[PDB]
Amino acid sequence: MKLIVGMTGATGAPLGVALLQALREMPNVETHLVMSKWAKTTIELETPYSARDVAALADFSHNPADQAATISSGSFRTDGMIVIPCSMKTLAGIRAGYADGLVGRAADVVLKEGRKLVLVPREMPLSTIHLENMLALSRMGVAMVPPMPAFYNHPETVDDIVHHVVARVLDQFGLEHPYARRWQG
Amino acid sequence: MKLIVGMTGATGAPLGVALLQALREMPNVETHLVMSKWAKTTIELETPYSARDVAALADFSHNPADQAATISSGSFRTDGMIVIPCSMKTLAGIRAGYADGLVGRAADVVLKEGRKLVLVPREMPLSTIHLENMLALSRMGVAMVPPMPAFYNHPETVDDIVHHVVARVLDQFGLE
Amino acid sequence: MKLIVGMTGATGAPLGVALLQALREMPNVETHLVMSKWAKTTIELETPYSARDVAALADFSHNPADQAATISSGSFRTDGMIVIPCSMKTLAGIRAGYADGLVGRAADVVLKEGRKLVLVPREMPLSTIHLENMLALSRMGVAMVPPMPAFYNHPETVDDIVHHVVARVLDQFGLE
Amino acid sequence: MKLIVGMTGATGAPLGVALLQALREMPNVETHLVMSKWAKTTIELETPYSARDVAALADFSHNPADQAATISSGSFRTDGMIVIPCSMKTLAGIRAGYADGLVGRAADVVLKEGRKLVLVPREMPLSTIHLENMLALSRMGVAMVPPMPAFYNHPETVDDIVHHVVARVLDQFGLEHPRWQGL
Amino acid sequence: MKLIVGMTGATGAPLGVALLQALREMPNVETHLVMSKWAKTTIELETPYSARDVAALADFSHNPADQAATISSGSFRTDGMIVIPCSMKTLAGIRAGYADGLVGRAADVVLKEGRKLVLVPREMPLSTIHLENMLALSRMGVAMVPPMPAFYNHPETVDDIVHHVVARVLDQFGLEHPYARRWQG
Amino acid sequence: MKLIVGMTGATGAPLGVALLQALREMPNVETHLVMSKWAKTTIELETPYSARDVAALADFSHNPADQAATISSGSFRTDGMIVIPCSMKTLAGIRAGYADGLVGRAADVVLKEGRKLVLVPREMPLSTIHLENMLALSRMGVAMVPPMPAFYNHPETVDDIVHHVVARVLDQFGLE
Amino acid sequence: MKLIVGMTGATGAPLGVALLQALREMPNVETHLVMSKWAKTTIELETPYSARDVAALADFSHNPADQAATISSGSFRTDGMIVIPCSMKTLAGIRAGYADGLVGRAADVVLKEGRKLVLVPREMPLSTIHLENMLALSRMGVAMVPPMPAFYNHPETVDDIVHHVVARVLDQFGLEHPRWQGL
Amino acid sequence: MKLIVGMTGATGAPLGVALLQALREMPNVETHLVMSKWAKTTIELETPYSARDVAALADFSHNPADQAATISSGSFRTDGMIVIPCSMKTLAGIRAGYADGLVGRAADVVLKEGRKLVLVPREMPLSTIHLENMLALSRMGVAMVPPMPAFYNHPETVDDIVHHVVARVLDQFGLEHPRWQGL
Amino acid sequence: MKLIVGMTGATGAPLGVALLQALREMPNVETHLVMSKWAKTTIELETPYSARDVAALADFSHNPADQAATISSGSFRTDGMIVIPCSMKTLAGIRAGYADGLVGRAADVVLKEGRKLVLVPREMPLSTIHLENMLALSRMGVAMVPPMPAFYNHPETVDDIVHHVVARVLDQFGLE
C-alpha cells in the first residue's frame, strides 16, 4: 500500500503529524509526503516539531513545486491520497483542477487514475464557496472528512480528539488505528 | 435580545450546554430552548447534566413536539436561532422544509421572517447529501458554523476547543 | 471602522488612490491596504505616486503574500473590504475560492464571516467567464460597483469621473 | 457595411453621439439610428445637441415604435447592431425576447439572423438581475462592452475616455477609430 | 426612514390604502407612492377613495411613467420599497428586470443598491410562471408577503384581515402596527 | 364552446382570418377576439380585410389594452385560447408572465386556470431566445403549432397551406 | 464554396429540390448531396422527380450509409451543411451525436470543425422533445430555419412560399437567390 | 495575420515546436510565443532544442510572468491563439478565468475580444474535472483539438503523427500545412 | 478474467488489434470481441489483418447485431469492457442508452451491473456534443482513456505510441 499525504496551511497541523505517526507504525505502508509552504509554517507554530522532523516521519518527501516528482506521474501506482488538514485554497484548486503545484497535481493525478482521494477540510465558518467546492468533489467520490470532534467516547484532551479524527480518516483506507474509541451502543 | 436555541442529537451536546451557560451570563438575552428527543439522550450521555438541568439554563424550554409554542409563529418576534449541535437529520428537514416538530418549525419560521439562522452542523465524514443540504441553506444566508478545532491558539483540553467554537457561534450575533 | 482595501492590477489605479485619499479624510476609519504585485506596476504607470506613497495613505499595508497578516484571521473583526480596481483574475480567484495570496485570503475570510465585500470590477469587454464569476459572487451579496461614467452631472475631467465612482463605492458603507 | 445603432436612456448619451460622429467619417458605412424615447431625454440633458441634430448624424433614423421599419425584418441585410449606451431595461427586454419596440425588435432580428450584436451596458452598481441577463446574452455571442475607462494611456478629459470607449466598441466590427503596446 | 410604496392593479387595493394609512400615523416615516394606471382603476372600484385621496396619504407621489423622478436614482437614499398589492405583470417585470415604468425602475434601483424589496403578490391560482418569478426574486432576498388570511386570532370582518396583513408586511421593516393580533400560544 | 382568439403582428394574418372564418361556420362556438396593435397593420397588409371586417367575424372583439375585459377574469369560464399567428414578442411576454395588455393577461389567466393554450408561433430563423421561450411554455402543456407547410397532400395554392394549418390548429380542440 | 446538402424524410421534399436547383445556377458552389432512405420516399411522393433526377442536380451524391465518403472526414474542407428539410429523427440524432449514417456523421463533422450547420426543421405540432433538441443545437450556433411561410410579400402559389424559404436559408451562407423593405 | 502561440508543460513539446516551424515557413504570419516555466522543462526533455532555440522560431517571445506584454491587452489586435500542448492546469486556469500569468491572460483577452482560441489539450486518462473544464470552454466556442493520432493515412514515424496533428490545428485558422479523400 | 473488447469504426484500429494481441499473451483472460460493421472497414484499411484474423485473436467474437449473445445478459459475469477505439457515435449511443446493437447493449449491461467500462474515445477536434457525452459517462465512473501520445519516454515509431496507449488501457484492469 502506497499512500500520498499532502499537508496544507489550515490550522490543524497536529492532525497531519498524528496521521503520519500512525502510518509510521504500519510497515506495509509506504508514505509519500508533500508539505505546502504554509503547512511548514503551521507545523512549526502548532506542534513542537519542525518541518524536517515531520519529513522524517515519511518514507519519501517531495517538494511542493516539484511537478516532476514520482507521484506527479499516473503510471507510478499508489493506493490514494490524504490531504490533512486541507485548506480552502487547496480544496478550491483541486475542484477547479488548477494543478499549479505538487499537492494539486498529485491530487489531479489521483482523480484521473481513479484512485481514492480523502480530504480533511478545515475552516469555520464555511461559506457558499467552500460548500460548492466540497460538493463538486464529493459528487466525484472524494471523501470529505472534516475534523469534527466526537464527545460520546468522553474525550478529555486535544490528543483524544486528534486520535479519533485520525482513526476515522484511516477507516477510509480500511486501516486500523490501534487506539480507536468506537461506538458500542 | 430574544434567541432561539435548538439542540439536536448530534454528538457534541457539551457544545450546546456551554452556549447556554454563556448566554445565562447575559441578562440582556432571552433564551428559548428546544431540545429534541435525541438531544436529551446526547446531553445525558456526554455531559454531567440531565435534560432538566439544561432546561433550567434557559428562560423557556419548549417541548420539541409543540407546534403551538410562541416561537412557532412568525408574529412572535425573535432575533434568530442557533441549532447546536445540528444533526444531519435536522439539517435535512430544514432544507426540505419538512417542519414536523418545533426545531424544524422554528427554523422554517426564522427563515420565512428573514431572521438570522445559525447552524452548528456536526457529522464526519460529510456525504454528498449532507453537502447538498448545507450548500442550499448557505445560498439562503444560513451561517454554517461546524465545530472545527483551531490549533493556532494551542488548546490543551476539550474545554478549550468547546470554548472556542462557542465564542465563534456567539460572534454571529455580535455577542462576545 | 475597519476597512480592508485591496488594490489589483486592472487599469484604474487612480480609482484606488483616490479612495484611499478620501478615507484618509475620515479619522474614524482604520485602513488595511493590500496592493498586489501588478497593482504596484499600475500605480506607478497611472498615478503621480510610488508604491510607498500609496502605502503611506493607509494605517496598515500588508504584503500580498503574507497569509499570516491580521486580516487573514476571521476573529480579527473588520467592517468589510473593497477591491479597487478589481482585475478579472482576482475576481476569478475569489469566486473560485483559490485564496493563493492575501487579497484572495482576506476576501475569502470576509465572505465566510458574512462581512461586506465590494468589488470594483474593471474590464472591457466582459466575457462569458467574467460574467459567470460576477454573477456567482453577486448571488452571495457581493456588491459589483464597476467604474461606470455618469454624464448626468456634467463631468468635465477624469477627476470628476473618478470622484463620482469613489463616492458611490463609499456609499456602500454609508460614507460620504 | 450596414450598421444599426440603437440609443437608450442610460446615462452616457455622449458615448452614442461620439460613435455616430466616428461612423459619419466612414463613407462605406451606412448607419441606421433608433433613439428610444428616454434616449432623447438623455441626449438633451447630457449633450449640446437636440434629438434632430443626432438623427442627422446617421444615414437613416427610425422611430422607436416603428415595427414596420426596414431594420425590423431579417430579409433586410445588415452587418449587425450596436446599442450605446444600453440601459438595464433594454438589456432585459432583449434577453427576454420581449421585442415591444424597434430597438428590441432589431436586436431580436440581428440575433435570429446570426449577425453581430454589441451592447454598451451602463448601470452602477450591477445587480444580480443585470448580471444574469448579461450572462445569458453573452453565452449567445452578444458582446458586452460596458464603458469602462482606461487609465494606462493617461486620459485628461471626458472626451479622452469617450473616444477610447468608442474605439474599443468599433473594434468589434473591425473598424479603426482615428492603444496598449509595450512597457 | 424613507419608504417607497408601489401600488399595482391586482385586486386588493384596500391593502395598499390601509398600509399607507398606517404609515401616515408614523412621523419618522417619509413615504414615496407610485400608483400604476391599473392600481388607480382598482382603488376606485374596491375602495370609497379616489386615486387623489390615496395620493394625499403619501408625502410624495410620483408618476408611473416618470423615469426621472427622485426614486429612480440610486444616489437618492431610501430604506426600501413595498409593492402592495403586487400584480403578476409587475412581479414578472421586476424579475426580468424590464424596468419600463417607474414601479419597475424604482424596484430595479432598490435591488441594485442592496435595499429591501417587499412584495405583496396577489393572484389565485398561482401558475408555474408566477411561482418561477417569485422564487427567482426570493433567492435574491426579496420578501414575498402574499395577503394570506390568518384565522387563529378570530377575525370577523375584512378590515380584520387587511390590518393583520398590513401589520405582517410592516414587520419586514421593524415597524409596529398598533393593532396587531399576534400569536400568544 | 368559448374560445379566445388572439391575433398578433407576425406575418400570417391570413392564418388568423381563416381560423375566425372557420369558427364562424360553427354556431356553437362563442369567439372572443383580441387583435394587437400590430395585428391590425398585418391584417390590412396581407388580407383583403380591414380591422373592422375581422372584428365582425367574432362575437366579441376586446381592446388589446383593456385589462378589465371579461376574459381577463379567471372566473369567466372559457375552453381556452389560440394565438394565431403568435409573434416572438408576444410569445416572450407570455413565457415571462409580463401581462402588459389583454393578449398577455388572457394567456396568463388561461394558464393559471389550467385551460388550454395554443400558440401558432411564426418566425424564421428561430433564435436561442425564441426556442428557450417555446421550450419553457411547452413544458407547461402549451401546444406549439407553427404554420409548417405539408406537401404530402399535394397543395397548390397559399389557401391550401393556410387551410391545412387551420385544420390542425382546430384539431387541438377536437374540431373539424 | 463547398456545401453539403442533406435531405431527410420530413414532408417538404419540394424545399430540398428547389434549394439544389438554386445552387445549380451558381457555378462556384460545389454541392454534395446526401438523401436519406425516407427522403427518397418523400421526393417521389411529393415531386415530379425521381431519386436519380435529384441526385443529378448536385455535383456529388453520397450514399446515406457511406461513412467512408469524402464528407465524413473533417480533413476534407467544406463551408458547411444544410439539412432541408430536417426530420425530428435526424434532428435528434445530431443533437445526441448518434452519427449512425452519413447525414448524422457529416453534420457531426461540420460541428466539430466549427463550420456552419443550417437545419430546416419541419414538424407540427412541435413537442417538448423537439424544442429541447432544437434549443441545445441552437446554443451551439446551429441555425434553426423552419419553413415558415411569409405573407407580407403577397404569395399566391406554393412555389412563392418554397422560393422565399430557400432565399432565407441561402442567406445563412451569404448567397443571393434570384424581401421586406418599407411600409 | 497575428497569432499567439502558448506552450505549456504537458508532454508533447514536439507538437509545439513543429507548429512554430510550420508557422515560420509562412511569411505573412506574425507569431507571438509564450512558453510556460514547465514547458521549457518539457521542451528540453522531449526535443533536441533548448528554450532559446524554440524562442528563435517565433517573431516575438514573451515572458510567461509578463502581464505588461503587448498581447496582454485587447487593444493590441491579433487573430487569436493556440495553446499547444495545453496542460490540465492551464486549461483549468483559463476556464476559471484565473489569469495569473501571460498564458492565462492572453487567452482571457482572446476570449473577451471574441477572437479565436484553439487548445491542444493533452492528458490521459481524462478525469471528470478535465471534461467539465473542456466542455465549459467548448460552449464558448473554444476549439478543443487533442493530439489524437490518425491511422487511415498510414503513419510510420512519430513525425507523421506530429505533422498531421499540426495540420489539423492549423485548419482552425484556415492555414494550409505542406488528408482523407475517398475509399 | 472475462473481458469484453468492443471495436468501433474510429481511426485507430491498430490500437484495438494491439490490445487483443497483448491480451492473448495472458492465458488467464477470456476475451469477448464485438467488432462493429465499420470497425471491420477500419481494421482492413489500417492493419495488415482481415476481420477473420482479428476475430481469431479472441476466445469469442460475437455478431454486432446479436442481442441474444451471452454478454447481453447481466447474469453472465464479466470483469468489464473496453471499447477501443471508440467512435463518437458509439460513445453517443452508450451515453443516451440507445442500445441498438451488441456493442451498445453490452455497455448498457456493464453499467447497470456496476462493472468497469473503459472507453478509448478517438476524435479531433472534440465538439460540444462529444464533450457533453464524455462528461456524462465520466460522472458515472466510466474511464476515458483517449489515445494521447506521450513524448517523455522518447518514442520513435507508431508502434511505440500504440504500445504506450495499450499499456495504460491495460492498467485500468491492473494488467501489465
Ligand SMILES: Cc1cc2nc3c(=O)[nH]c(=O)nc-3n(C[C@H](O)[C@H](O)[C@H](O)COP(=O)(O)O)c2cc1C
Ligand atoms: C496560522 C494560520 C491559520 C490558518 N488557518 C486556516 C484554516 O483553518 N482554513 C483555511 O482555509 N486557511 C487557513 N489559513 C490560510 C491559509 O494558510 C492560506 O490560504 C494559504 O494560502 C494556504 O496555502 P496552502 O493550501 O498551499 O497551504 C491559515 C493561515 C494561518 C497563517
Ligand SMILES: Cc1cc2nc3c(=O)[nH]c(=O)nc-3n(C[C@H](O)[C@H](O)[C@H](O)COP(=O)(O)O)c2cc1C
Ligand atoms: C450518541 C449518538 C451520537 C450521534 N451523533 C450524530 C452526529 O454526530 N451527526 C448526526 O447527523 N447524527 C448523529 N446521531 C444520530 C441522530 O441522533 C439521529 O439521526 C436522530 O434521528 C436525530 O434526531 P434529532 O435531530 O431530532 O435530534 C447520533 C446518535 C447517537 C445516539
Ligand SMILES: Cc1cc2nc3c(=O)[nH]c(=O)nc-3n(C[C@H](O)[C@H](O)[C@H](O)COP(=O)(O)O)c2cc1C
Ligand atoms: C497596464 C495594464 C493594464 C491592465 N488592465 C487590466 C484590466 O483592466 N482588467 C484586467 O482584468 N486585467 C488587467 N491587466 C492584467 C492584470 O494586471 C493581470 O491579469 C494580473 O495578473 C493581475 O493580477 P492581480 O489581480 O493580483 O493584480 C492589466 C495589466 C497591465 C500591466
Ligand SMILES: Cc1cc2nc3c(=O)[nH]c(=O)nc-3n(C[C@H](O)[C@H](O)[C@H](O)COP(=O)(O)O)c2cc1C
Ligand atoms: C437621466 C437619467 C439617467 C438614467 N441612467 C440610467 C442608467 O445609467 N442605467 C440604466 O439602466 N437606466 C438609467 N435610467 C433609467 C432609464 O432611462 C429607464 O429605465 C428607461 O425606461 C429606459 O428605457 P429605454 O431603454 O427604452 O431608453 C436613467 C434615467 C434618467 C432620467
Ligand SMILES: Cc1cc2nc3c(=O)[nH]c(=O)nc-3n(C[C@H](O)[C@H](O)[C@H](O)COP(=O)(O)O)c2cc1C
Ligand atoms: C378588477 C381587476 C382585478 C385584477 N386582479 C388581478 C390579480 O389579482 N392579480 C393579477 O396579477 N392581476 C390582476 N388584474 C390584472 C392586472 O390589473 C393587469 O395585468 C395589469 O396590466 C396590471 O398592470 P400593473 O401591474 O402595472 O398595475 C386585475 C385586473 C382587474 C381590472
Ligand SMILES: Cc1cc2nc3c(=O)[nH]c(=O)nc-3n(C[C@H](O)[C@H](O)[C@H](O)COP(=O)(O)O)c2cc1C
Ligand atoms: C409586416 C411585418 C411582419 C412581421 N413579421 C413578424 C414575424 O413573422 N415574427 C415576429 O416575431 N414578429 C414579426 N413582426 C414584428 C412584430 O410586429 C413586432 O415585434 C410587434 O411588436 C409585435 O407586437 P404584438 O405581438 O403585440 O402584435 C412583423 C412586423 C411587420 C410589420
Ligand SMILES: Cc1cc2nc3c(=O)[nH]c(=O)nc-3n(C[C@H](O)[C@H](O)[C@H](O)COP(=O)(O)O)c2cc1C
Ligand atoms: C410522407 C410522410 C411524411 C412525414 N413527415 C414528417 C415530418 O413532417 N416531420 C418529421 O419529423 N417526420 C416525418 N415523417 C417521418 C420520418 O420520415 C421518419 O421519422 C423517418 O425515420 C425519418 O428518417 P430520416 O431523417 O433518416 O429521413 C414522415 C413520414 C412519411 C412517410
Ligand SMILES: Cc1cc2nc3c(=O)[nH]c(=O)nc-3n(C[C@H](O)[C@H](O)[C@H](O)COP(=O)(O)O)c2cc1C
Ligand atoms: C515531463 C512531465 C510530463 C507532464 N505531462 C503532463 C500532461 O501530459 N498533461 C498535464 O496536464 N500535465 C502534465 N505535466 C504536469 C504539468 O507540467 C504541471 O501541472 C504544471 O504545473 C503545468 O504548468 P503550465 O501549464 O503552466 O505549464 C507533466 C509534468 C512533467 C514534468
Ligand SMILES: Cc1cc2nc3c(=O)[nH]c(=O)nc-3n(C[C@H](O)[C@H](O)[C@H](O)COP(=O)(O)O)c2cc1C
Ligand atoms: C477511415 C474512417 C475513419 C473514421 N474515423 C473516425 C473517428 O476517428 N472518430 C469518429 O467518431 N468516427 C470516425 N469514423 C466515422 C465512423 O466510422 C462512423 O460514425 C460509424 O457510423 C461508426 O459506427 P460504429 O461506432 O458502430 O463503428 C471514421 C470512418 C472512416 C471510414
